[PDB]
Write a protein that binds this ligand. Structure first.
Ligand SMILES: [Zn+2]
Ligand SMILES: [Zn+2]
Ligand SMILES: [Zn+2]
Lengths: 55, 55, 55
């Protein structure tokens, strides 16, 4: 299904920014991953959008 | 259900504080939602009450 | 269940770090318990490793 495929993508990028010692982008995709999994897809986009806009 | 009503109520306030760009409150209600959703409410009021007294 | 034993261990130390009001360590073991509860044990050790080295 689509959602567990999404759960794959967040896992790849989240681990990558944990290595770089990025505890502002690693803590963030911990939040986004939970929202996608529970079904709060709308809130996930709002949370992620500000980071992309900023950096 | 008792816990289902609580879960929606946190979502109402949580969304309201992500649009305002508040990354202290919006981050905090991510944790409080998970504490209630899992069955550890006593730790939720420990995390929640410190924000209320501070703000 | 052996994962339940790990989850109990995280609880004991997590509440031990909420009385002191340590909001660096406490928010960290929120993520670690979430990592262990789902199966991302490989990320949990890397997440917790950084805290051990500093402190
Ligand atoms: Zn991480
Ligand atoms: Zn949010
Ligand atoms: Zn806590």
């Amino acid at each position: 299904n689509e959602r567990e495929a999404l759960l794959r993508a967040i896992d790849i990028v989240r681990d990558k920014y944990s290595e770089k010692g990025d505890e502002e982008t690693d803590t963030l995709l911990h939040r986004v991953r939970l929202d996608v999994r529970e079904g709060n897809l709308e809130h996930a986009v709002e949370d992620l959008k500000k980071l992309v806009e900023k950096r």
